[PDB]
Amino acid sequence: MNLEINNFAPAISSIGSQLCSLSAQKLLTCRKQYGNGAKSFEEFYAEIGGIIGMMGINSQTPSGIREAIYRLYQSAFLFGDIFPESFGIQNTQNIKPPPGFTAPAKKLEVVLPQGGAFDLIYNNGEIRVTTTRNVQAGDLVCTVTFPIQGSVIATRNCHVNEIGGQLTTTRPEIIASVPMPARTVIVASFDAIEIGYGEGDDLFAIGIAILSNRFNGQITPMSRHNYMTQMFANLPANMSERDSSAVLHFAQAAPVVLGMMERLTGAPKWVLDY
Amino acid sequence: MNLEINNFAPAISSIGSQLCSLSAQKLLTCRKQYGNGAKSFEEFYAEIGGIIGMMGINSQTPSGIREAIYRLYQSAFLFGDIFPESFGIQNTQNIKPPPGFTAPAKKLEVVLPQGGAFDLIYNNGEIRVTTTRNVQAGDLVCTVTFPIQGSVIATRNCHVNEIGGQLTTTRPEIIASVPMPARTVIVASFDAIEIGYGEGDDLFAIGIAILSNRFNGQITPMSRHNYMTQMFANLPANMSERDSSAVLHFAQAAPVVLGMMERLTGAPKWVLDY
Amino acid sequence: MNLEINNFAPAISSIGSQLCSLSAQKLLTCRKQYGNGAKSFEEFYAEIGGIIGMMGINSQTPSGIREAIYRLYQSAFLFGDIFPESFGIQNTQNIKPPPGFTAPAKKLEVVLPQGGAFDLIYNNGEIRVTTTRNVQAGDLVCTVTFPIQGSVIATRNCHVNEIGGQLTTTRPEIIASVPMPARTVIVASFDAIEIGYGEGDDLFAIGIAILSNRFNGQITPMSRHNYMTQMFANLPANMSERDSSAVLHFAQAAPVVLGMMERLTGAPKWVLDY
Amino acid sequence: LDNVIKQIEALSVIVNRSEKADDAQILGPNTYKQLLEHLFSPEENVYILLPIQAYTGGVIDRRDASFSNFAYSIASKLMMELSAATHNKIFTDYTRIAASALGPEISTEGMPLFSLIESLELTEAETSRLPVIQDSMVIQKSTATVGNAQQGISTINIKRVPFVGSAFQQVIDQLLWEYSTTSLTTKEQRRQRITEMVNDRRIMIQKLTLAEKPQVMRHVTTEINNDLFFKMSPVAQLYIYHLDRAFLDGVGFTPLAEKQQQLQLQLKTNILTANLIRSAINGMNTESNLEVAIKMMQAAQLHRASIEIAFPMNVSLSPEIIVQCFIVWMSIPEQLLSDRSNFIIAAVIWAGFSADDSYADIMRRSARASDRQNYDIIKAALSSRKFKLPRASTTLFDENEPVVRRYQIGRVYAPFPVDRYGSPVYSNCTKVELASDYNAEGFTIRKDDFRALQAVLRIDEDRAADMFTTLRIMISSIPAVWYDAEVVHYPHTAVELEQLAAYGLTGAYPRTNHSVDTIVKTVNNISATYSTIAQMLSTIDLDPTRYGTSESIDKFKIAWENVESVLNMEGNDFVKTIMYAYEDNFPKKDFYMMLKQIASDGQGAHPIAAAIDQLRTIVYREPERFGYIDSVILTHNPDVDTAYNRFFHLHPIVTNQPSNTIKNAQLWNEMRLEQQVEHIKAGPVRIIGPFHVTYNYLSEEEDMPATSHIIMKDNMILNDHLTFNFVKRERRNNKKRVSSFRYKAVEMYVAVRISRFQLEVLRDLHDLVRSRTYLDVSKSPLATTPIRVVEYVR
Amino acid sequence: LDRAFLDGVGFTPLAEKQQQLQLQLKTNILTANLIRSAINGMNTESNLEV
């Protein structure tokens, strides 16, 4: 995908996340009070599920909500810098923190240094390397570029900076402890969490196609993990980690809510409880 | 970590869990009624989110809740002989059951019995040992100490007492089925749930440090798994399975709520739905 | 650390220092009349420790002062050169003088001439170098990059400009005075005062963590001396001593007050009497 | 004791209709005041300008705590009087010689230049310089900028005319000009702001002529906007309720007899047979329909003030309860009722249609916490294909009548169940069909009875025009930021079941006879009262250094006095009445804290604060202009200061170095004579405390008025006035030598003297000219009429 | 010593308390609200001893 994130993304992502949360709450409220099976549930929702009051949005139909998320997503991610005042946010710094990430880090990105000393095999939740030549102990073998946090389990022939089983650093650096010659293998498994959210995986698949049909020149369908990795890698350099979470929440919440508005199922906790 | 859990622990734990659930409910209620404006979210929460009225908490600020958590935690798990007579502890005749555990069993604890005849390594979901000599059929090779509950998948060159896919006992043991040569490898994977919960691990990291800075000589920061294993190992033998659940619920609810009051994000479902 | 200081740093610092002094004075005022009853001092401070009449602050609880300090620090020292219209800045030229520095210069900062001619080792208050090769009298040996004022004691085999035992220039240079062969050693001790305020070092350590947990991308925990050396190195060249003094006073007062609002002990004199 | 404030509210609203002209925006012409000035000349090319006392207002601090208190007292009391003379006036008028062919326009503004010949005894070679000074006093023109960013940055033309006088007069006049010209703007900027605030194209603002554009007006210090109204949220519910109660004086219901006849006609039952649904509306009355209408309107405006119903029943039921619950279900929208109110009536309805459930069981098993869920379930059950009961509902409205207001408005629900078209609104189906009858305990209702009840509950189409004018004027005159306010007085949202049933049966709606502008004028009055209190607090009480949250409750009497003094002036009676009536629910301390927060958040202080701060500095530098001296020296051997001999024949000014200073006059007075004479012998003695002195400047010929500095009646006691005598040296008597005979013979052995003096000496006659600022009326005239909307062309 | 030094007492008369209850609790007559029936039956003749 091709896109650049404006330097005022969090102030727009806050409004987008609030809109998505209100949409999800309205959907659940309509779900609970649906008691007559004569009318299709789609018809009942299309009748009263679009009436939501907020600054900027002035529509009483789901189509207006869809255009609202479309415009917010476009302003925040596809185009260049746009000032937050256009959407009428009163204050830029007064943004409510988003829920913490709960996505399991099954696949873990690592970058080997130059020289091709090691080979990389990814398994379910760990990484193995095979050493093709002689290596002295005390040198980096791997480094993690995708921020990660959690415990460490089943480390063999390697050392990582940690105390009590908890990783001290977000980006760990795996090093050797004892010299191992003649085509060895070392592992480093982690019981950690990544930078996305785990629930609503199907809804993301349904909504990513919906919002890629519109911005076909910028957005393409793919998996949630790759989408999150590219969005994280495309963030501006001068941005605190407190404000990156705000934009990363909306980046994943928009496809999920777009898909959810089609298949009127439940909503994930990280979307509704914002 | 040094700590002595007394007989009076369930009475303290019930009050602690109730206080934590009330704090989480207030946090979410004030998080839904926040309108963006001049005041930031933390100022808004400080003014109204703190107010909670129970016997023994004497403050309409989060500092009162923090001190109540500190006092209850010290009374229940710390070495000093302290009991808070000011709370609603006198009418603790009946205790509401705590929610069931949901923590995945990724690193399960086992103990090789004797003789150094097996070498142990761990994986994301499975364990495996290498026999250094001949072994007879139907003998004990490993047994678990941390209780688990769930199904068993992908067992090779061994046997476990399971019927229909479900383990019959909370402490399964693995036994070889056929006399096997040296260098043979036996494996056993489990799709089970260990003690404690899984959600809220980000809050645990920043709450364990908070409650370790106060009791600086008694508690050392470390991961949730080691914390729960030590808490279980320090439980008295003469305790029912119903009271131990409440004790272990409070032992994790205290740090996560302490960390939740710092980062004003959401709250885990197990903390809130007590 | 990475941080950019704008041309209007003195204006922000003159408000931040006043806010810090107000908060400290209120802390002592409330500390003098503590009832010593069932409520702890933390609840007492959280209930009556706020400022009600300052433009810029939007809450009557301590959290308001904390949030104002966060805004002022971010505006003054971080990447965003945002001018805070919320606090009332009428004249950017008027600046009340800050108190003089009190930090003893134990680890004095010096740089070698780049000829690879001397070895540098440190002591409690003196530096001493050993000649690797032959050196003639009347050439540079060392020079200080961190400005220092005070007296000079125990000057051996070297010369510094001095009048009555007092240093003349704020950046003294050490030049050898005698032809000294065969790997001899020269010493230079200073009973002087560096930049910053020695008192209240315990509060700085606990407050730097508080403000680094928020601006983690720009600020990292460290000692006071290194923090002040980097802060002084990042000052603009077009800056007088009257303004840099205010900038540095706020730069040290902000972590100290942030850590003082957690551990409710006293406040240093240089913070109270600003 | 309940209607004691209704009369107050009615009188306030009625007097609010008495239109009063406001000069807040209108200024007037003004002139600088001439200060007393005595000038003399002792010799050629030497002109002395004596400092004459201009202001005599001061208060000596008997506690002797500090010296700044005395200066502040003088400055504040002087500025009180100075500000009262230039209230709504601008300095525009000055004396001049009109320009002609004889030369350019010149000023004759100070004292006339001709009088200086007699006043200074000028020679014929110095009189020749007077005409060339007069011809050099030309007037210079320039421009000054006015207005802030919130208002418009305008430009006014100014003049700088020369006048002859002292520099002290120049400084005083400059202070007066800088104080007077705060918050000025032009008419075109004001019209632009008015056009921007009123976005409605229907209202047209009067166009300004070419001559009315540069005219200058006075604007407010800070504008009243939605931010001010937002901060009033805690007490906003009381204001909303009392505005509704004052401005809704009628109710459009239908009399009950016609409803009874309609129900009798619709009922398919014999007249002899007794039916309980018929016999239950005969015991009802439309009494208090007005109170229920007011509470309906409040529940429509505020979503937090949902109605709570008081049910007389506890465990059992009754035919009246059942029929009234059905009427409430079919006639009152659910968005105006609280969750418990909805759940109780829903359970009453369901207990009869349920096969096995009973009212007592539903109440006991259910929890008040989950009433909304249970209500949703029961409504879904009653909206199925076996049972169908239409539940009344309502929608939001956006229409509004055009009016000039400073705040934004929102949208509210309607207090009636119909749409803009005029057809009843139901949450579910509009049809009634039931499988079985209604049975709960022994009470039973036929299936056609509900159909008849639905038939009779149709609102009259004819009243639709009158039914919406009130809603329009209520939507268009209440600020939107008040709609999220909480509830503070519970009885305002409480009504019993019979009253609500009678209100809903007759199809009542609120009605009014007032216009939109009266309501917005009342709201503007409330905002003005809040702004006045905030400004007073900001200019008097806004101090963060001491006595804040930690202050003891004993200090609240002092702080509250100013607020309750402000609340007792004219035009603040609405807020005062509301505040004093409901002190129990909203105390004085929370009100004070809310006002304090309102003032701290950017509310500007009254300009006089800076004026007094700037004038107090002037007070310090020139003491004898305000008639006070820092200290006096008592001595037996005085040493005259030779420098002043040049200007005065004899003066009370000495230069002895004091010894043994004494703190205040009282300590010296209470001393005995033996100790007093020991002090005098050892050298000069100094009395430090400030005094109220006056200076007499006399000619050599005049005899000297006696002053009793020290009265030796029983002890050497100092006087509290200490009048001093100067005799001037003129060109008439400059070479003569005057003896100190008259000065010392009438003086005691102990002398009272002065250590310092200040006067201005001028070496050139053309240094007497100074400058002042005036508005150029020719090019920036004063506005004479306010900006108005176009109406009634004739 | 308490009896000698404490001369009088300060309190609001029961009349004002009854009016305040009436305003704060707007309940119609003929409804059997017993808070009023209890409060209107009091007297403050023994405030000092207490």
Whole-angstrom distance, CA of residue C27 vs CA of residue C256: 13
Alpha-carbon gap: B59 to the closest alpha carbon of chain D (Å):
16
Gap between the terminal Cα atoms of chain C: 27
D647 and D733 in contact (C-beta within 8 Å)? Answer: no
D578 and C87 in contact (C-beta within 8 Å)? Answer: no
With H, G, I as helix, E, B as strand and everything else as coil, classify residue B91.
coil
With H, G, I as helix, E, B as strand and everything else as coil, classify residue B173.
strand
With H, G, I as helix, E, B as strand and everything else as coil, classify residue E9.
coil
Structure tokens at C252: 């040290």
Q: Subunits touching A (CB < 8 Å, at least 3 pairs)?
A: B, C, D
Structure tokens at B42: 């933390």
CA distance readout (Å), C223 to B5, B97, C208: 39, 48, 9
Residue C218 and residue A240: Cβ atoms within 8 Å? yes
Q: Could you tell me which of B259, B142, B136 has the C-alpha nearest to residue B208?
A: B259
Whole-angstrom distance, CA of residue A172 vs CA of residue A169: 6
3-state SS string over D695-762? EEEECCCCCCCCCCCEECCCCCEECCCCEEEEEECCCCCCCCCCCCHHHHHCCCCCEEEECCCCCEEE
Q: Could you tell me which of D272, D281, D255 has the C-alpha nearest to residue D452?
A: D281
Give backbone dihedrals phi and psi of C231, rounded to 5 degrees, phi first. Answer: -60, -40
Angle at E11 between CA E7 and CA E16, to 5 degrees: 155
Select the residue of E20, E23, E28 nearest D2 (Cβ to Cβ).
E23
Cross-strand bridge partners of residue D698: D727
Q: Which residues contact A53 (CB under 8 A, 6 or more apart)?
A: none
The identity of residue C274, as a single letter, is Y
Give backbone dihedrals phi and psi of D25, rounded to 5 degrees, phi first. Answer: -95, -20
Alpha-carbon gap: E45 to the closest alpha carbon of chain D (Å):
26
β-bridge pairing D89-91 and D28-30: parallel
Whole-angstrom distance, CA of residue B264 vs CA of residue B31: 9
Structure tokens at D130: 């007077």
CA distance readout (Å), D214 to C87, D26, D146, D209, D414: 35, 14, 12, 10, 48
* C102 burial via Cβ count (<10 Å: 0-12, 13-18, 19+): middle
Structure tokens at A270: 């990280």
3-state SS string over B47-59? HHHCCCCCCCCCC
Which residues in chain A are contacts of B28 at CB distance < 8 A? 273
DSSP assignment letter at B44: H
Chain C: residue whose CA lies nearest to D597: C52
Cross-strand bridge partners of residue D51: none
Place of tokens 């032009």: D186
β-bridge pairing A118-122 and D717-718: unpaired
Give backbone dihedrals phi and psi of A12, rounded to 5 degrees, phi first. Answer: -85, -35
Residue C216 and residue A93: Cβ atoms within 8 Å? no
Whole-angstrom distance, CA of residue D62 vs CA of residue B47: 47
CA distance readout (Å), D138 to B106, C82, D90: 97, 49, 22
CA distance readout (Å), B156 to A51, B108, B138, D496: 58, 18, 14, 75
Whole-angstrom distance, CA of residue D513 vs CA of residue D777: 47
With H, G, I as helix, E, B as strand and everything else as coil, classify residue B78.
coil
Residue B38 and residue D484: Cβ atoms within 8 Å? no
C→D interface, C-beta within 8 Å: 22, 25-26, 29-30, 33, 48-55, 57-58, 60, 88
Print burial letters for D604-613: b (CB count within 10 Å at least 16), e (below 16). Answer: ebebbeebbe
Print burial letters for D38-53: b (CB count within 10 Å at least 16), e (below 16). Answer: ebbbbeeebbbbbbbe
DSSP annotation string for D538-574: HHHT---SSSSTT--GGGHHHHHHHHHHHTTSTT-HH
- In a 13 Å sphere around the CA of D231, the CA atoms on its Cβ side amount to 27
The identity of residue C227, as a single letter, is Y
β-bridge pairing D28-30 and C185-193: unpaired
Give backbone dihedrals phi and psi of D314, rounded to 5 degrees, phi first. Answer: -115, -55
Q: Residue B240's CB: how many other CB atoms inside 10 A? A: 8
Residue A91 and residue B28: Cβ atoms within 8 Å? no
- In a 13 Å sphere around the CA of B125, the CA atoms on its Cβ side amount to 16
Contact exists between C and D (3 or more beta carbon pairs < 8 Å): yes
Whole-angstrom distance, CA of residue D180 vs CA of residue D28: 12
DSSP assignment letter at A178: S
Structure tokens at D292: 């229920």
D144 and D155 in contact (C-beta within 8 Å)? Answer: yes
Residue D601 and residue B38: Cβ atoms within 8 Å? yes
- DSSP strands (E only) in chain C: 110-111, 118-122, 126-131, 140-144, 149-156, 162-163, 166-167, 173-175, 185-193
Gap between the terminal Cα atoms of chain A: 28
Angle at D509 between CA D508 and CA D514, to 5 degrees: 140
DSSP annotation string for D459-503: PPSTTHHHHHHHHHHHHTTS-GGGTT-----GGGGEEEHHHHHHH
Q: Which residues contact D655 (CB under 8 A, 6 or more apart)?
A: D639, D640, D641, D755
Whole-angstrom distance, CA of residue C92 vs CA of residue C84: 13
Whole-angstrom distance, CA of residue D386 vs CA of residue A113: 73
Whole-angstrom distance, CA of residue D556 vs CA of residue A137: 74
Helix C224-233, helix C241-260: angle, nearest 10: 150
Give backbone dihedrals phi and psi of A249, rounded to 5 degrees, phi first. Answer: -65, -50
Structure tokens at D626: 């305000």
Q: Residue B19's CB: how many other CB atoms inside 10 A? A: 24
β-bridge pairing D154-164 and D140-146: antiparallel
C45 and D567 in contact (C-beta within 8 Å)? Answer: no
Whole-angstrom distance, CA of residue B9 vs CA of residue B5: 7
Which residues in chain A are contacts of C79 at CB distance < 8 A? 238
Print burial letters for D659-685: b (CB count within 10 Å at least 16), e (below 16). Answer: eeebeebeebeebeeeebeebbeeebb
Q: Could you tell me which of D773, D767, D628 has the C-alpha nearest to residue D167?
A: D767
Experimental technique behind these coordinates: cryo-EM
Cross-strand bridge partners of residue B194: B103
CA distance readout (Å), A128 to A120, B259, C9, D107: 6, 35, 51, 99
B257 and B24 in contact (C-beta within 8 Å)? Answer: yes
List the helix and strand counts (H, then E) for chain B: 7, 10
Alpha-carbon gap: A214 to the closest alpha carbon of chain B (Å):
31
Alpha-carbon gap: A98 to the closest alpha carbon of chain C (Å):
15
Q: Count residue pairs from B and D with Cβ separation < 8 A.
A: 3
B137 and B178 in contact (C-beta within 8 Å)? Answer: yes
B180 and B98 in contact (C-beta within 8 Å)? Answer: no
Which residues in chain B are contacts of C43 at CB distance < 8 A? 58-59, 61, 63-64, 67
Q: Residue A243's CB: how many other CB atoms inside 10 A? A: 18
Whole-angstrom distance, CA of residue B124 vs CA of residue B104: 11
Which residues in chain E are contacts of D491 at CB distance < 8 A? 24-26
Cross-strand bridge partners of residue B118: B131
Print burial letters for D326-344: b (CB count within 10 Å at least 16), e (below 16). Answer: bbbbbbbbbbbbbbbbbbb
Sign of CA dihedral C89, C94, C98, C100: positive
Q: Could you tell me which of D4, D6, D3, D14 has the C-alpha nearest to residue D522?
A: D14
Give backbone dihedrals phi and psi of D625, rounded to 5 degrees, phi first. Answer: -70, -25
Contact exists between E and B (3 or more beta carbon pairs < 8 Å): no
With H, G, I as helix, E, B as strand and everything else as coil, classify residue D300.
helix
Cross-strand bridge partners of residue D634: D685, D752
CA distance readout (Å), C203 to B43, B263, C261, C267, C274: 23, 22, 9, 9, 18
A114 and A143 in contact (C-beta within 8 Å)? Answer: no
DSSP assignment letter at B97: P
Whole-angstrom distance, CA of residue B14 vs CA of residue B5: 15
Q: Give Dmax (Cα) for chain B.
A: 75
| A95 φψ region: left (φ > 0), alpha (ψ -120 to 50), beta (else) | beta
The identity of residue C32, as a single letter, is K
Whole-angstrom distance, CA of residue C136 vs CA of residue A41: 96
D616 and D70 in contact (C-beta within 8 Å)? Answer: no
Whole-angstrom distance, CA of residue D669 vs CA of residue D675: 11
Whole-angstrom distance, CA of residue D256 vs CA of residue C56: 60
Give backbone dihedrals phi and psi of A173, rounded to 5 degrees, phi first. Answer: -125, 115
Cross-strand bridge partners of residue A40: none
Residue A154 and residue B263: Cβ atoms within 8 Å? no
Whole-angstrom distance, CA of residue B73 vs CA of residue B66: 11
* D109 burial via Cβ count (<10 Å: 0-12, 13-18, 19+): buried
Whole-angstrom distance, CA of residue D248 vs CA of residue D470: 9
Structure tokens at B137: 């059929």
Q: Give Dmax (Cα) for chain E.
A: 50
C164 and C194 in contact (C-beta within 8 Å)? Answer: no
Give backbone dihedrals phi and psi of C242, rounded to 5 degrees, phi first. Answer: -70, -35
Which resolution, in Å, applies to this structure? 3.1
